[PDB]
Scaffold this active site. Sequence first.
Site, PDB file in Angstrom:
ATOM      1  N   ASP A 191       0.815  -1.199   0.000  1.00 36.79           N
ATOM      2  CA  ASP A 191       0.000   0.000   0.000  1.00 36.79           C
ATOM      3  C   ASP A 191       0.854   1.257   0.000  1.00 36.79           C
ATOM      4  O   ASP A 191       0.548   2.221   0.684  1.00 36.79           O
ATOM      5  CB  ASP A 191      -0.935   0.007   1.199  1.00 36.79           C
ATOM      6  N   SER A 192       1.933   1.242  -0.762  1.00 34.98           N
ATOM      7  CA  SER A 192       2.773   2.409  -0.918  1.00 34.98           C
ATOM      8  C   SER A 192       2.894   2.660  -2.406  1.00 34.98           C
ATOM      9  O   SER A 192       2.729   1.739  -3.204  1.00 34.98           O
ATOM     10  CB  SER A 192       4.104   2.172  -0.265  1.00 34.98           C
TER      11      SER A 192
END
Lengths: 46, 67, 115, 42, 50, 49, 50, 48, 260, 524, 446, 49
Positions: free
Chosen positions: J201-202
């Site tokens: 989730d980056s």
Amino acid sequence: QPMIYICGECHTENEIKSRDPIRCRECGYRIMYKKRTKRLVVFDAR
Amino acid sequence: MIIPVRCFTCGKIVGNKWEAYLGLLQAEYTEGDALDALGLKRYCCRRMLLAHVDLIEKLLNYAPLEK
Amino acid sequence: MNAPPAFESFLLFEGEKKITINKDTKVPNACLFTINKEDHTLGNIIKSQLLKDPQVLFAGYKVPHPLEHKIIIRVQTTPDYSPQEAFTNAITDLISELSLLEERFRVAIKDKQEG
Amino acid sequence: DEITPDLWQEACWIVISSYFDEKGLVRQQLDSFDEFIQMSVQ
Amino acid sequence: IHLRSTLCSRRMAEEFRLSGEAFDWLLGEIESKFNQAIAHPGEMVGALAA
Amino acid sequence: IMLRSTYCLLNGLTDRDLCELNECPLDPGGYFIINGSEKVLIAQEKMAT
Amino acid sequence: GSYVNYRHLALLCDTMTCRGHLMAITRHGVNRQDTGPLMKCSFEETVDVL
Amino acid sequence: LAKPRQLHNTLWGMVCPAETPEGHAVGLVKNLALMAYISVGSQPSPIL
Amino acid sequence: PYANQPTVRITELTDENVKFIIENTDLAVANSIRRVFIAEVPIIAIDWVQIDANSSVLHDEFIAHRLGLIPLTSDDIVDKLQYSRDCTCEEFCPECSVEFTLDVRCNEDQTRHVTSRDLISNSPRVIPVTSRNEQDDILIVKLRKGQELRLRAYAKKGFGKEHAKWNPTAGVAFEYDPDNALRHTVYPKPEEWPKSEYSELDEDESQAPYDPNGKPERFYYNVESCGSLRPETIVLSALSGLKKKLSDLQTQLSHEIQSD
Amino acid sequence: RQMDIIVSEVSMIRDIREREIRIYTDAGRICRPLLIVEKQKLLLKKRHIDQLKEREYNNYSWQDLVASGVVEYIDTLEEETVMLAMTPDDLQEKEVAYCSTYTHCEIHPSMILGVCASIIPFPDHNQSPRNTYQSAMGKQAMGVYITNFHVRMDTLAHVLYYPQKPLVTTRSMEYLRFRELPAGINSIVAIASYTGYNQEDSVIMNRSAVDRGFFRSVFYRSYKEQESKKGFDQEEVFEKPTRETCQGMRHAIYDKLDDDGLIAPGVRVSGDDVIIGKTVTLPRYTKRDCSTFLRTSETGIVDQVMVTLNQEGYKFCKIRVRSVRIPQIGDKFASRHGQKGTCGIQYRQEDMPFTCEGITPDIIINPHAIPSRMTIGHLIECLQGKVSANKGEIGDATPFNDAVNVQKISNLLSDYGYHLRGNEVLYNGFTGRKITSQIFIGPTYYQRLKHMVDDKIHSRARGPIQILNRQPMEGRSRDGGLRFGEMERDCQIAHGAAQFLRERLFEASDPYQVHVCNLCGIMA
Amino acid sequence: RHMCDGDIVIFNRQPTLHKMSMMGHRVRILPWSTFRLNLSVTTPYNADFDGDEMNLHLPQSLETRAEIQELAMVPRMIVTPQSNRPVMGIVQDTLTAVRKFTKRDVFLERGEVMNLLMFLSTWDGKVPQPAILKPRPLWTGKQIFSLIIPGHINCIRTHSTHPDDEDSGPYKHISPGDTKVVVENGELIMGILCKKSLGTSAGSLVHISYLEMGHDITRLFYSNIQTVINNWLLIEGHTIGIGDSIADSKTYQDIQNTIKKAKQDVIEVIEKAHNNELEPTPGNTLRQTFENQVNRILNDARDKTGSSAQKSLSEYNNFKSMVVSGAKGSKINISQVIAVVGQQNVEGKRIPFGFKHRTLPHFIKDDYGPESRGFVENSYLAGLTPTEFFFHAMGGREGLIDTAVKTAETGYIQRRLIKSMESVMVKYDATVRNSINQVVQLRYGE
Amino acid sequence: RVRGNLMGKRVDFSARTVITPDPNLSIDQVGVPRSIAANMTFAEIVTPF
RNA sequence: CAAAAUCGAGAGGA
Ligand SMILES: [Mg+2]
Ligand SMILES: [Zn+2]
Ligand SMILES: [Zn+2]
Ligand SMILES: [Zn+2]
């Protein structure tokens, strides 16, 4: 020494000393804004 | 608030094509037609013009601070 | 707040040497060149040119961290050669290739522009 | 007279645009306050 | 029980086919790997369990 | 006084007037000003009488 | 389908029956044994304990 | 108790199904649907 | 163990873009040329602003930022100038920088459009691009009756590895092996895929047959400019820059080996 | 229905199994408009649509539409006794007519959603907790919050330089005015595993797009102060102090102030400086410095200084400072499908993977965010957005709309010289060679959430402490400490590390010595 | 002096649920403003990078530094006492990639190999012999992973898609599908690697390397896997698109036909019950037997559609690529994204009759069909019709409240157990005792 | 007092900030910004070494 | 040479 302000409503310069109530002397408006300084800020267009 | 100078992705100048794009629009060209008139090929540049929301016009309604 | 200045990517800090040669005790006739303030643009060309030489047994390079600005090149040559020699000859041949290419591009421009 | 199936998909949106032009989104707050002031104080 | 069965005298001749040197090494190995499994005194097993 | 309601000074004003009062044409109203902070009365559920 | 070693489960059970009666993991059972006042006051119900 | 925190059948059209604060106020704070309009009150005399 | 003999064949040339092709060279070399077009060709661009007055509806940083991204004409000057780090003069001087000015006040009841035509430059060789002698000018800000903007800014030399405003191009398009001969991409269904503009294939055939021996040659370049440099000038400056990087590196290497 | 004596909002039920009729006029009931149905036909004929279409000439408003017995407010309790057609197709006599005695219709199904859930495009291809998170993150997304922000002294405000309306947009957004105060930018997003910095989730942003104004912001923060003359005992006043007369002066210089004691607009303040020089008369003599400083390490520019008199009639002041926020590693960016994630790294234009026409992406997100979450709306949005930007439209993402499905978007996309399913061949920007897979790339609308890393970094090494128990203060504002709670103590007892435990819980926090009698043991 | 490179810091994330939630790291000073961490070590901390934050402590003595370095360091903690299996293994992009790197037909060139070998720290220096010397020198992916594997460890596993009957017939030892991993003298002789081989299972390569070699050898093993495989994935790439969510028309027709069948059977069951033709099973009333039968029908329908979808997929499908590797997701996700979302239960039962014998006002009263009580017959790619949207919202709300109301009680239990057992410890007598010094166990764990 | 100021408590020499991926660090390394390190210290004892 | 309160409410973040 002068400390000119701007009458928030009538946009009129007017010069007020300390310990003096803030009140415009064209329209009686109570809100006033300092003026832009004269020092020099540099910006990098970055 | 105002049309970006460069396309973000490619960096092509779209600053000088906003008022022209609007003028084309009021000449009864479609968005696609106007965009092919101005020479924006990639969908990135067209994304830039076609998704603009010109808010500065609103801000030119409020009267200035220093008259 | 902790944003490094943008010119750190290419301007040598004072006292840092552009290129820094080492040996490699892993095997014989190997070296580790470390070049400061460089990236894939020069690493890839130097490496690809090295692999054209038939006296180079192993050439590769790596960028240790994207957020610092150095590369490391590891070249290993045959025992009758020397990896510093190989590196120098690679750069020499890249320069010759670029010079020839620039000339030919000028000629082609002259033609097409002249019609 | 009847809205054929092909015009329905913009009939309904003309209707909804008319609704939101009449009312607004925060009508409930304003109308409740008008009620209070007009009547409940008296 | 487990050691005595897997490390049998018939299995060791029909399955594993070890040699004398191999068997000596194996015995030393089992001894060490056992002696390193023992709880270290002062170990807080209560908080570990909880 | 809830803003934009029938007893607010901005009731019935046209957009040009609002801009000339430094009031947003888009700001929907429906809140109070108590000491220059904007307060909003959150609707409360309860059992029918 | 999860798995937890046996040492931890055994330690919890044995802590919880070590005194001959069933001990609850609560201020009624934990805080009533002979742990000395300061640990008791740390766990729960400080004022009464002290 | 999660019974008052659940999406009831009866919220169709009145309260929005998706918009809630997902912390500890979950299911207890709600937003009106778009066309939902809350009545303001009338006097029952003329009907009667 | 010796260099290539590339050949260049040029397919188009305008003031907007050059469409050329290299051929008989490495992929690493081709893509390093591509990377240099973007990030190591130097041009001119405002990077020092000083707002003496501003009533407009945009704050000062906004105007500064939006001034840096106006392309200037770096055609023949950028080679003559110095990086200000490299100049021994003070903060500014005609060798290292170029001075711009802007003073605009609005009086009419209809909005004035400040644009790049109101940037007046000190040096006549360096000017905004649209100003150069169609496309209008880069609208910087709009001033209703009353506002007034007056500033004074400097233009310096840099390259795109430092900041994206010094990037001269507006999209390098690069390609090789237009038909998937080398199988550097595996299509799960090669028929769904549109053909390339450069591809040489009958419409029935989707991709070329596998060629185990070949490796890339014939890279197809299409360099489009933003206006600072005409395209061929971009490419020539790029080849010079890559060659000079390698020359400096070789000098340093000779120093190090000599020391060892 | 005739607007007769019974006003519109009068609910009217008829329990039928039991024999009661119930009529309500009270306040507080909730209701919504529905269309009224004849035998099997709407009462809304095209007469009405014709007259509404020129709603601006005929002043045939909505009120004339309820007044003519066509729509009807039906509330939560009267709904128990209606039969709603979802759409006028349910009216059509079917091979097996389902109910065939309908009473009302829905105007449109998509009006069962709210003001933040009406932004989500294709919400019906998303898994529900996705839609709920996006509802909750659409309220944190920096945009333009109001047209007249230039005259407001909000305590905090964030304003986005270049907000763009979505290229893919539900029709409900028309009435939320989202097309005039929009809260985000359109990005070219690519879904790729690329160098490893966009895992978990980056995202990988582009530094060149960011140097051209992408997602830049300005952050405003206003500072109050008023000179209190509450008594002649002690009174405050604005005045440029001096090194000689005040007592409680920090080492921070006071030069930036003006003669009246207020810094002027356009002065580059740094962190830990003075913006108001306020000196309270003492009972370093006869006055103590009570100057107002900035929140530490902010470094803005004074924006404007308003001066005025409060209700009671002393001087009042509001200073507004302006800090520009360029996006950077650690900033939270999210899309309209509950896909949040911080920025992991930034690459220049020549290190990003490009296409056969050099369209590098703005953002690269991980292909692993998709399968666990089941946000298919994200992918359809990217596909529809590519079609729209090549066609010159704004797509329609309204939820329940049978006229738009993937096969139609894909056919439309194949006609602009693209693979139908949105894939492209990208090249590797570091090394130039193609990537063996084809990467999925197109234009998606992202938001920039208010949670920037510069407001969260904290560090303490022996600062101030509390007055009662000499332990560090709490908070970044107070230069506080970080709590070494009880769970950490249990963790370190499990570790067996008693010296580190002693150090944390004694020596780092509050060391102290006392002298104790050896006999009574009560502190000598 | 200011904190410098290499200092020992403890590193924490809250809630601190076990002893792997505080661990000792070595410092490395970097430009920007965040605490950059590695990726393997996000399982112990239970972290991800959607705005999470973490604390950092700095021991202030040689005593404390030595203690942390000798007890709490990250390498020392790889295998956990709770369940005697490694606590951190390989994760998302590394896991998907390494499943791909190791497929039977991944052949590397020369330049590519030397690139990849630049990222091996523990590289002896010597390029191995290619697996194919003519016509072209090509190495393979097993052949490079065999350089990553430390020591001379020996291991056997089986890939997730291993057809279990395979080991029975012939071809036990030449797998047609290349499953049945066999490491042997520290060289990957065969097999594809996946979660079962590099995850946190017991007996995985990470575990066997830990037990056999040091913990520094294993530390380097993690690092090497990650770096080598990321720098190959630059060449290989990974995506997920629409093209992965589609199925061909034939399988769409299969799915629709199965759904039609299931709904028809449920209609049949209903009208049986309306004719008093249904009789209860032992231990269940008529309502419950009716419901159980209908639920069984619909669950079987969902399973059959999911199987049809899973089989329809080609071997380039990226959903299947991340599922088989173990990296992310499971086959129910593929079923729902492609085939059918299935039944939405609210407290384990179908949707309840919240209106008066109606789930909503769009249905007639006493409607027990599949549509009325909340059966979603659409994929997430076909959309959801408005009533399915509402019922799906109700189900999701159950999940949200559950996540938001379990936590308090569990936290209380954790606190209560800790305070109960805390001071029990193993003594120098080898006994186990409490603070009061009474025996709890004559030997730890018997 | 007890659970708030004896069993757990605020401590010096401690930072907080956001985590971000980094594939290039070994498993036992952590990345720390320059400002955090510039702020926190460590008493090194002077010796002839 | 250290300068800058406490108590309640609310909204958020993981
Ligand atoms: Mg998280
Ligand atoms: Zn006035
Ligand atoms: Zn573009
Ligand atoms: Zn100079």
